[PDB]
XYZ file of C-alpha atoms in Angstrom:
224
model
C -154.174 79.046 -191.976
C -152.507 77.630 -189.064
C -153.717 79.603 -186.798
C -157.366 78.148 -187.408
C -156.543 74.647 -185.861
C -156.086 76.759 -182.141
C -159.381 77.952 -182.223
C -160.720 75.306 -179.691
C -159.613 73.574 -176.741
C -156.585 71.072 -178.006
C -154.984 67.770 -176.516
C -151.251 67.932 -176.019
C -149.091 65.063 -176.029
C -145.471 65.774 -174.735
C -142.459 62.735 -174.756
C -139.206 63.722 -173.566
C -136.017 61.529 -173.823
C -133.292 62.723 -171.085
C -129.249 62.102 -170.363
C -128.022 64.343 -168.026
C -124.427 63.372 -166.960
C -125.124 60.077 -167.840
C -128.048 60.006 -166.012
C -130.845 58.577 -168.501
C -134.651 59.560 -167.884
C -138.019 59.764 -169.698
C -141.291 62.310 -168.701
C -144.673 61.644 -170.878
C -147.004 64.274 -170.584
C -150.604 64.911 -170.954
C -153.257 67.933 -171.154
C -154.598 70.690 -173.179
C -154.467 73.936 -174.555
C -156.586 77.047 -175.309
C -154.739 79.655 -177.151
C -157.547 82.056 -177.386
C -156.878 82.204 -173.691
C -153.164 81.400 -173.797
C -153.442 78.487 -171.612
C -151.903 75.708 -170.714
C -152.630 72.854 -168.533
C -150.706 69.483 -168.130
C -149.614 66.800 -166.325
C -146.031 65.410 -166.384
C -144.649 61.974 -165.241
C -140.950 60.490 -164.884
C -141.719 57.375 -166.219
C -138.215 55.663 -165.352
C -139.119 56.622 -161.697
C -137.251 59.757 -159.775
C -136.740 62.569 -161.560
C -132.712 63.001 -161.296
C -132.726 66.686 -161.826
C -135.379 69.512 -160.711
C -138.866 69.744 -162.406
C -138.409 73.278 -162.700
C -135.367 72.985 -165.117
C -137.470 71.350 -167.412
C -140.611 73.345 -167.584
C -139.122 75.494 -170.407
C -138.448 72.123 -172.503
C -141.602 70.425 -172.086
C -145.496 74.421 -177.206
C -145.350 77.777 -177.941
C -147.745 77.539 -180.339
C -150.786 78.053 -177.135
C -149.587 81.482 -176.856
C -152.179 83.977 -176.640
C -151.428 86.478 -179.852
C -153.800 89.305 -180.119
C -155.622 90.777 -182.672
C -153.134 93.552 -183.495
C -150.217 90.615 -183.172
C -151.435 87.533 -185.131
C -149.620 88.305 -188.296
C -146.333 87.896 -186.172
C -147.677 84.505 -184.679
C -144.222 81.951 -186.213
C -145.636 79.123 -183.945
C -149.024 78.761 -185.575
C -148.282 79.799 -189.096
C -145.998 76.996 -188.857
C -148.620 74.326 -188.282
C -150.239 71.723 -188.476
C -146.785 70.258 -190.319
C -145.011 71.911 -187.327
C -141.436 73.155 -186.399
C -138.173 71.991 -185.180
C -137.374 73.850 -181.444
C -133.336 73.746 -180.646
C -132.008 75.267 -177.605
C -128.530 75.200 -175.454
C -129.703 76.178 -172.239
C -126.506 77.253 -169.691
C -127.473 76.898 -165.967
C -124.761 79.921 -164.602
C -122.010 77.965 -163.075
C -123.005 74.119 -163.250
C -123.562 72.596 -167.265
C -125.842 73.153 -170.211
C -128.448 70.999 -171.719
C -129.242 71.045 -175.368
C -132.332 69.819 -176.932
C -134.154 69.341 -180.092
C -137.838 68.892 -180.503
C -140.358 68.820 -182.736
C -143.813 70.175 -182.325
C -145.975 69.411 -184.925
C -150.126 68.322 -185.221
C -150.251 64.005 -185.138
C -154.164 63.979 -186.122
C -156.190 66.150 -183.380
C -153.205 65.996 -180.807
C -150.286 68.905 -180.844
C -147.338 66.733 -179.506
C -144.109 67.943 -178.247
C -141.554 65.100 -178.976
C -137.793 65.984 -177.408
C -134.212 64.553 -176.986
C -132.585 66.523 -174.202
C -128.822 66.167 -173.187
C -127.344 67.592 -170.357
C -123.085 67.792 -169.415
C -120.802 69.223 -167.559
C -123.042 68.917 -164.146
C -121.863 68.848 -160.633
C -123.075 65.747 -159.382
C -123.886 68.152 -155.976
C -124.810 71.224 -157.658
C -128.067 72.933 -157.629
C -129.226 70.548 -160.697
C -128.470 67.437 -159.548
C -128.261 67.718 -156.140
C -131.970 69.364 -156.121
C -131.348 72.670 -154.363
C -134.094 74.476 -156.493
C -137.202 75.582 -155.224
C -140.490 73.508 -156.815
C -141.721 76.646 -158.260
C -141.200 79.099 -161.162
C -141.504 82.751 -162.016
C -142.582 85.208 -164.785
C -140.224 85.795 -167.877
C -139.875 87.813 -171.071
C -139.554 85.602 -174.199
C -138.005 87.732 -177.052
C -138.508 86.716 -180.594
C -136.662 88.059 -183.663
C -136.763 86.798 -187.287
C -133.585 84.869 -188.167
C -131.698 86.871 -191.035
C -129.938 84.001 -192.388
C -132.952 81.214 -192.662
C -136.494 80.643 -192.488
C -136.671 80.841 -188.671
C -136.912 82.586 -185.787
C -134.704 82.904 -182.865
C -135.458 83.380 -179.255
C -133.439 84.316 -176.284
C -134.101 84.913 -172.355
C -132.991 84.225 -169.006
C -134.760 81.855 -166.492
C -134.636 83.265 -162.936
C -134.135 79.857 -160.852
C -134.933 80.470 -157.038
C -132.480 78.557 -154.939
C -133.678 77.065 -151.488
C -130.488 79.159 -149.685
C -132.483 82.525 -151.146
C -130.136 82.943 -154.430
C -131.208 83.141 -157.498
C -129.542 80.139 -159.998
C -129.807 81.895 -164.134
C -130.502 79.537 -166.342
C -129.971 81.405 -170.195
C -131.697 80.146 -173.241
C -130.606 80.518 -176.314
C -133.290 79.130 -178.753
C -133.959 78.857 -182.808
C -137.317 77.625 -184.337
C -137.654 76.311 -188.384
C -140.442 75.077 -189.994
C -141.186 71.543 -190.921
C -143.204 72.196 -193.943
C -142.959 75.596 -196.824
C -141.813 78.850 -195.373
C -143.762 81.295 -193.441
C -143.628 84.817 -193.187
C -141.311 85.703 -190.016
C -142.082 88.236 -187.533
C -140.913 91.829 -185.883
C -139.421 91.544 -183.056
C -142.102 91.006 -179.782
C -141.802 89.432 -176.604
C -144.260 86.654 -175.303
C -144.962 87.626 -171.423
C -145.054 84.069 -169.820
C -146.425 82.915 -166.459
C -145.904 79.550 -165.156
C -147.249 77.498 -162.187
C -145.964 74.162 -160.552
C -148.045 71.788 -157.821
C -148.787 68.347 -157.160
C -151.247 66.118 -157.417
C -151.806 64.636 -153.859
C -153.198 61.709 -155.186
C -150.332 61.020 -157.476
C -147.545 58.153 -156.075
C -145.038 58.770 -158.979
C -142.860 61.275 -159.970
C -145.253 63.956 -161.568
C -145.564 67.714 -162.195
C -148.509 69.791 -162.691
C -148.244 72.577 -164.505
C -150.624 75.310 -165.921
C -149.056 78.677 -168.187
C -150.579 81.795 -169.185
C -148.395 83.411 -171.863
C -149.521 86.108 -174.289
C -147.709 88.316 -177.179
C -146.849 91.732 -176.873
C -144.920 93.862 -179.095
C -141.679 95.801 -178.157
C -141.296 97.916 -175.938
């Protein structure tokens, strides 16, 4: 099964393609996984040069598939199951008071590498807002990821809220609404479980461009 390609250490290739009020950007990405650990490592770059909007409102668009799913949870594991042909990730994503972006991505096996390949559009920003005017603090915190099967499709869907911590000491929400459909045949869809997800930015001091790096820890758990 799917699930059997995650057994090792994998290389992770992420592209993103970015408009945010007009604003056009690209971030490549590079790393690996180990979802017997639920791990993550990477390294992003803004490859057209500054980053126009925070690196933490991206983190939850640039692989779910590296989640750590016990024992007792694999037969509710979408994101593998799905693979190696992959899956087709949507989300609108509504930062409380400023604009949404909406994406669509495909995650999917090319050969050995899992690659994450994205179109992201953002609107209805204010050009001195928390999002573009960078007023977001270069770090991230833990969040609940629930997953339900979708009743009208093969599919999941997926819904939280991103806790954004503000430089001024607010918190700016950023809610996710989020669907996931195969590529290839149907798969058998899960109960509804939350993936507990951890998330930690820095820098690479000997890195002149624009760059995150970014390791996750995320594992299953069922409800409650």
């Amino acid at each position: 099964k799917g699930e059997e390609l995650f057994t090792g250490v994998v290389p992770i290739l992420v592209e993103l393609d970015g408009d945010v009020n007009g604003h056009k950007f690209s971030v490549s990405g590079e790393g690996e996984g180990d979802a017997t650990y639920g791990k993550l490592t990477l390294k992003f770059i803004c490859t057209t040069g500054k980053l126009p909007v925070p690196w933490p409102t991206l983190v939850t668009t640039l692989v779910q598939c590296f989640s750590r799913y016990p024992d007792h949870m694999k037969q509710h594991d979408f994101f593998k199951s799905a693979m190696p042909e992959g899956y087709v990730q949507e989300r609108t994503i509504f930062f409380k008071d400023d604009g949404n972006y909406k994406t669509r991505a495909e995650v999917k096996f090319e050969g050995d590498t899992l690659v994450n390949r994205i179109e992201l559009k953002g609107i209805d920003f204010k050009e001195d807002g928390n999002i573009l005017g960078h007023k977001l603090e270069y770090n991230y915190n833990s969040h609940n990821v629930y997953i339900m099967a979708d009743k009208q499709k093969n599919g999941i869907k997926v819904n939280f809220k991103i806790r954004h911590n503000i430089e001024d000491g607010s918190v700016q929400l950023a809610d996710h609404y989020q669907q996931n459909t195969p590529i290839g045949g149907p798969v058998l869809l899960p109960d509804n479980h939350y993936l507990s997800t951890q998330s930690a930015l820095s820098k690479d001091p000997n890195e002149k461009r624009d760059h995150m790096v970014l390791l996750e820890f995320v594992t299953a758990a069922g409800i409650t």
